[PDB]
Design a protein around this ligand. Sequence first.
Ligand SMILES: CCCCCCCCCCCCCCCCC[C@@H](O)O[C@H](CO[C@H](O)CCCCCCCCCCCCCCC)COP(=O)(O)OCC[N+](C)(C)C
Lengths: 175, 70
Amino acid sequence: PDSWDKDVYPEPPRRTPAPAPQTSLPNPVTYLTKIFDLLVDRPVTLAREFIEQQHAKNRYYYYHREFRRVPDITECEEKDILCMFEAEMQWRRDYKVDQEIVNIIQERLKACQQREGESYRQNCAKELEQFTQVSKAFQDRYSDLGAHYSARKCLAKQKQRMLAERKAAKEAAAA
Amino acid sequence: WIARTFYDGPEKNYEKTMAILQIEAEKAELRLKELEVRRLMRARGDGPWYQYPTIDKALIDHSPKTTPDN
Ligand SMILES: CCCCCCCCCCCCCCCCC[C@@H](O)O[C@H](CO[C@H](O)CCCCCCCCCCCCCCC)COP(=O)(O)OCC[N+](C)(C)C
């Protein structure tokens, strides 16, 4: 369906076998699906076509809101309240977007596990690896900030992580 | 329809918040400055505040006083 992007939500080509009856006994499943089609799918389709033509008679649009980029907390003065307000709002929007990215990857993983069947342990390696990377990045960014989280605390956590990384790199180089 | 007849856009609340934050930050800075100025004026006595009266020098009598040495 065109309602979603196929690249953002990938799917395998979905190869299905062909009916190969081996006996002369008529299977009840095919007849049941034919009567289901005739008694259910046709009236539902007709009602849908009526509703779709009514919707086509009245077509109107809504838009995705675009947000400009503003200076972040790393270029705000100590007490400049307006810049910190703008940077805090931008950081909160970015936090929400990152949460939704993690949600997309988790949906991919769950769909893979259901789809692959008994061979999910081997056939869902890529989704597991992607989720591992995204989870690691999200945990590095946002974990342990508390309920009163803010952009300043995230910046402090990043600064401490970079200090630790720099110290470890200098210690390893000067080994 | 609900958004059209009951609410405004995000920018209104955004900019009202900006104005409110500016007012409050200015007030906080003014309060700190006033406390510091009060401390300095009370310690030194060189400002318009905390002026305690001294004897008016217009009350002194400048005349010969029946005695040459005042
Ligand atoms: C198909 C329909 C499905 C949805 C049904 C929706 C039901 C709606 C009822 C719920 C009402 C929500 C409460 C809203 C009150 C506060 C909102 C307020 O701000 O709106 C004011 C409008 O006030 C409303 O008129 C209040 C409606 C309350 C009355 C409810 C109707 C039924 C009550 C029964 C009354 C008694 C019946 C008689 C008995 C004898 C205008 O304020 P304003 O600052 O300009 O807004 C600025 C934004 N602008 C620019 C878009 C204007």
